[PDB]
């Protein structure tokens, strides 16, 4: 970062023989560094160093401290760095901080030199900006994306579930019933299997077929918003379905698949037609009690055992 203005502040304080370090000193230091974005932008408004020096002299030992307003300006400039510029702060951030806090000797100099605030802010934004100036909206809102988490690196690692991941991979590569179901007791790592599959997709370990397929965890918490209106949940289920259809690269993880087997008549044509690829997680008792009874669901889902 450019700390040479802060280094100037004391030097110009001694040079003018003042008993404080104010906003006018900081402006003088921005003038002192001509390379700065703030210096060039303010020079574009015909605000040059000698005019600032004359205005400060017209306007306005050893125990020199930044005035509370100078500290406030610095804090605001750090807060202005929340404009997706990470920790590093620049001269234009300091200028934006001075612009926002339209109070102090610097604000008085701006008013005295007839400098517009909004125009200066727009100039700084344009200088920082770019001179030269698909998606499933509903699925991305009610479902948790695992591939984006894996790319971000926030996803926790998966250890030792290589056989289960390979089994899921080979099930997903089928032509007719490429829908794996993870069978195991709660808390054994069934969701970890899907997370590891997402990691393998990101780490370029999956085969060519699943090279660029996203793994979206269709959380079934409150997809069933209202159980009394006729078609209120069917409508949003159909919407999620046609969004998944229009972008044929979405692998879907449905935790507790037995809760949806109300939605059998809607998911059945899509699964049988190949527009949706699903990964389910259930318990062995629930699987036997719900899914095995219906021969239609068996013709779509392939069980994978996840052991403790």
């Amino acid at each position: 970062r450019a700390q040479r203005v802060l280094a100037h502040a004391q030097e110009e304080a001694i040079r003018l023989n003042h008993s404080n370090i104010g906003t006018e000193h900081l402006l003088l230091g921005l003038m002192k560094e001509p390379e700065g974005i703030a210096a060039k932008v303010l020079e574009s408004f015909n605000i040059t160093e000698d005019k600032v020096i004359e205005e400060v002299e017209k306007l306005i030992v050893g125990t020199l401290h930044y005035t509370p307003r100078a500290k406030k300006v610095i804090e605001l400039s750090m807060d202005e760095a929340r404009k997706l510029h990470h920790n590093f702060v620049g001269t234009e951030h300091i200028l934006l901080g001075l612009i926002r806090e339209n109070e102090g000797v610097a604000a008085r100099v701006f008013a005295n030199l007839d400098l517009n605030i909004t125009k200066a802010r727009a100039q700084v934004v344009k200088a920082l900006g770019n001179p030269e100036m698909n998606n499933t909206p509903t699925l991305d809102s009610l479902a948790r994306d695992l591939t984006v988490i894996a790319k971000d690196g926030t996803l926790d690692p998966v250890i030792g579930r290589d056989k289960e991941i390979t089994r899921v991979i080979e099930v997903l590569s089928r032509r007719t019933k490429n829908n794996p179901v993870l069978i195991g007791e709660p808390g054994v790592g069934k969701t970890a299997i899907a997370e590891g599959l997402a990691q393998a997709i990101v780490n370029n370990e999956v085969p060519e077929t699943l090279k660029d397929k996203r793994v979206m965890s269709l959380d079934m918490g409150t997809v069933v918003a209202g159980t009394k209106y006729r078609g209120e949940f069917e409508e949003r289920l159909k919407k999620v379905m046609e969004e998944i259809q229009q972008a044929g690269n979405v692998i879907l993880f449905i935790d507790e698949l037995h809760t949806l087997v109300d939605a059998s008549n809607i998911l059945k044509p899509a699964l049988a037609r190949g527009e949706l690829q699903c990964i389910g997680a259930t318990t062995l008792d629930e699987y036997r009690k719900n899914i095995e009874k219906d021969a239609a669901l068996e013709r779509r889902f392939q069980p994978v055992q996840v052991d403790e």
């Binding site: 404080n20 906003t23 005035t67």
Partner: protein
């Protein structure tokens, strides 16, 4: 207006302005008010002082204090006068530097 007021949160800020500020070589009359612990600084300029020195001061106070949140009439009513005609001298004489 020839009557400004600014708001000092604490007496530490008043000491900071009294010590570390070199106000413009101007003549003025200073009074200190206090309500609910908040310090209000009122300075009155004669008929020869320009508003530019007033905004410069109001910024040095603004560099050491906050803008007034109470009108002049309210302070003349409820605020107790603490110092008059000499603020900086008496705080410098009694209080030491920070």
């Amino acid at each position: 207006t020839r009557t400004i007021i600014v708001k000092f949160n604490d007496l530490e800020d008043v000491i900071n302005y009294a010590y570390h500020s070199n106000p413009i070589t101007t003549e003025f009359e200073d009074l200190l008010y206090m309500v609910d612990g908040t310090y209000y600084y009122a300075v009155y300029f004669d008929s020869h002082v320009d508003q530019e020195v007033i905004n410069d001061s109001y910024s040095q106070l603004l560099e050491f204090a906050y803008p007034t949140d109470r009108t002049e009439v309210y302070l003349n009513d409820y605020a107790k006068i603490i110092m008059s005609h000499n603020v900086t001298a008496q705080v410098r004489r009694y209080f030491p530097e920070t």
